[PDB]
Write a protein that binds this ligand. Structure first.
Ligand SMILES: OC[C@@H]1[C@@H](O)[C@H](O)[C@@H](O)c2[nH]c(CCc3ccccc3)c[n+]21
Length: 435
């Protein structure tokens, strides 16, 4: 038996473009994920977020699933171009109304909204002006965030500026695998820097607008282990929270990031560091897998290990979640931490019995929840844990071919089938831990 602290926030998480569909409904502007996925060759099977889980219509049912499962928190994101179709200036009341209804429904059901302000669907109109490459995005983002705080901050008290700014910068602008699909290392590091400035500006406005709320930021993290007996030190500093937390807490990028990337950063990047240090209330960590890592003349390659893997091909390494939780306290001692995403893709099928017997996912969640428990026992101020995801959904460049949900979605009918893992999780939430 592993019981969690009183009032521990058990959650599930989604993102607007991945679940909503109807990207252009009710006066919404195009996002970069709309244009990226409608470009041939970018997404597996030519899949797009045009329909997705149709959450844009089915939102009430979906929240009723959250309620029935007894889940206590919902992390969801807001589509920037639903709110400001051109990115700045005009505010679309119908986009505000869409999320207002979600927010009021969650509150009425006593479910705590965690709102991710940016989970990757930049307005296309701002991408035309360079998007994350343009320093002015700190102003655009601040204006957007202000709108959200002004309209929703009376009810929503827990806010996340950015989901996984490393992914946004590097996967979007160096690897070219995500929107806006670019491969320029100088643009990618200017996006890193501008994401920090935009984050800090948004926190600054939050303090002026929502005096009773909490705001944080979310980072992706891998558990990197050395193949033999430094490449690990670099992967952690670059791929994990330190890329952003070293600026936020210490006023500079980490040491091995500067060694590799100084030339790609703006020359006078330090001038912005004072503002980047804006105080945050919590850190969200997303964690999924581990990686065997070796020097290789970025001077690092991964090494395949046996290990059970998910359908993503991601090595299942549960002690990784413990390690990253301990490590973030050891390095930056944030006052609160949340696991804002943890989950697994498996090749789910509906059995003849009408059920989805995803024991593989139960095993994955159970193992990680157990390790997060361990971290709490050794003093990590973990305040919550969010399963990625409530629903099978549009998995970015993998399209619909990867299912991460604890609820199965039959996309032909939009039927939701609660998976064994969903039922299992509901029991964990009800009991406030494992047994
Ligand atoms: O891959 C599953 C989930 C996504 O559906 C979420 O939107 C996103 O927040 C998220 N981040 C990660 C870990 C970082 C990552 C992103 C993209 C590709 C590979 C790793 C895994 N996930």
């Amino acid at each position: 038996v592993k019981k969690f602290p009183e009032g521990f926030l058990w959650g599930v998480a989604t993102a607007s473009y991945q679940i909503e569909g109807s990207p252009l409904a009710d006066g919404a502007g195009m996002s970069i994920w709309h244009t990226f996925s409608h470009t041939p060759g970018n997404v597996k099977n030519g899949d797009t977020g045009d329909v997705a889980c149709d959450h844009y219509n089915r939102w009430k049912e979906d929240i009723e699933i959250i309620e029935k499962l007894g889940v206590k928190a919902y992390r969801f994101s807001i589509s920037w171009p639903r709110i400001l179709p051109e990115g700045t200036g005009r505010v679309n009341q119908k986009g505000l109304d869409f999320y207002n209804r979600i927010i009021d429904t969650l509150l009425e059901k006593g479910i705590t909204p965690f709102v991710t302000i940016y989970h990757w669907d930049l307005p296309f109109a701002l991408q035309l002006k360079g998007g994350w490459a343009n320093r002015e995005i700190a102003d655009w983002f601040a204006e957007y965030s202000r709108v959200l705080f002004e309209n929703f901050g009376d009810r929503v008290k827990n806010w996340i500026t950015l989901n996984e700014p490393w992914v946004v910068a590097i996967v979007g602008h160096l690897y070219g695998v995500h929107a806006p699909g670019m491969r320029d290392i100088y643009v990618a590091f200017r996006a890193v820097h501008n994401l920090l400035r935009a984050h800090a500006r948004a926190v600054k406005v939050f303090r002026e607008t929502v005096k009773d709320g909490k705001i944080g930021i979310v980072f992706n993290n891998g558990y990197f282990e050395p193949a033999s007996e430094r490449a690990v030190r670099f992967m952690h500093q670059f791929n994990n929270y330190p890329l952003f937390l070293n600026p936020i807490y210490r006023g500079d990028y980490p040491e091995l990031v500067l060694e590799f990337a100084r030339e790609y950063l703006p020359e006078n990047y330090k001038d912005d560091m004072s503002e980047i240090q804006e105080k945050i209330d919590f850190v969200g960590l997303n964690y999924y897998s581990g990686h065997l890592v070796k020097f290789d003349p970025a001077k690092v390659s991964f090494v395949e290990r046996d290990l059970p893997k998910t359908a993503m091909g991601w090595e299942i390494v549960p002690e990784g979640i413990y390690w990253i939780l301990k490590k973030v306290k050891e390095e930056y001692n944030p006052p609160e931490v949340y696991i804002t995403e943890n989950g697994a893709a498996f090749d789910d099928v509906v059995s003849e019995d009408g059920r989805v017997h995803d024991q593989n996912r139960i095993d994955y969640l159970k193992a990680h929840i157990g390790q997060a428990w361990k971290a709490i026992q050794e003093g990590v101020p973990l305040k919550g844990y969010f399963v990625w995801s409530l629903l099978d959904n549009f998995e970015w460049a993998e399209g619909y071919s990867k299912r991460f949900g604890i609820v199965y979605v039959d996309y032909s009918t939009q039927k939701r089938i609660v998976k064994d893992s969903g039922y299992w999780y509901s029991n964990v939430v009800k009991n406030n831990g494992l047994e």
